[PDB]
């Protein structure tokens, strides 16, 4: 029981880490980020997609 209680606490910690991490306002690990393309060139259609998973 004692260990499980500790695991349960750590468990919640992982969950918050995933739901609290936020570059500025945009969340990252919650799962909403999905995939965004980052234009890294001086012309359109140069963006390279980047994906963050739950």
């Amino acid at each position: 029981v004692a260990i499980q209680e500790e695991i349960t606490a750590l468990n919640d910690e992982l969950n918050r880490i995933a739901e609290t991490t936020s570059f500025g306002g945009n969340k990252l690990l919650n799962g909403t980020f999905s995939t965004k393309s980052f234009q890294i060139g001086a012309d359109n259609g140069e963006a390279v997609m980047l994906t963050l998973k739950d």
Binding site: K36, G41, D43, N44, G45, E46, A47, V48, M49
Partner: protein
């Protein structure tokens, strides 16, 4: 190739049309009026998979960047605009130079 790489490939192989990818993942081909004079007939296996739609008109006055797709398309529109602007300047440049030479001859 992923949708984004496809767009870059097109932009690389041709300068007649300028591709882009919106937020959902749809491809955005823009053809400036100063280069193309009519609707483009997209064809081929890729076309079949992409199912390219009609060509709405997009003048600078209509550039909305509140969405990535709109931003990407807007870059293309601005580029077509800059070309039109410059070209006109060039034309006017000749006028000045031509009138300059004319003044010289008239004075002679």
């Amino acid at each position: 190739d992923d949708i984004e790489e496809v767009a870059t490939y097109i932009n690389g192989q041709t300068d007649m049309v300028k591709a882009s990818v919106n937020e959902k993942g749809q491809l955005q081909i823009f053809a400036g009026n100063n280069k193309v004079t009519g609707d483009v007939a997209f064809s081929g296996g890729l076309a079949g998979a992409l199912n390219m739609q009609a060509g709405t008109a997009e003048t600078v006055d209509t550039i909305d960047v509140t969405s990535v797709g709109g931003a990407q398309q807007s870059v293309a529109v601005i580029d077509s605009a800059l070309k039109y602007v410059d070209s006109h300047r060039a034309e006017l440049g000749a006028f000045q130079n031509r009138f300059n030479h004319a003044i010289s001859n008239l004075d002679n």
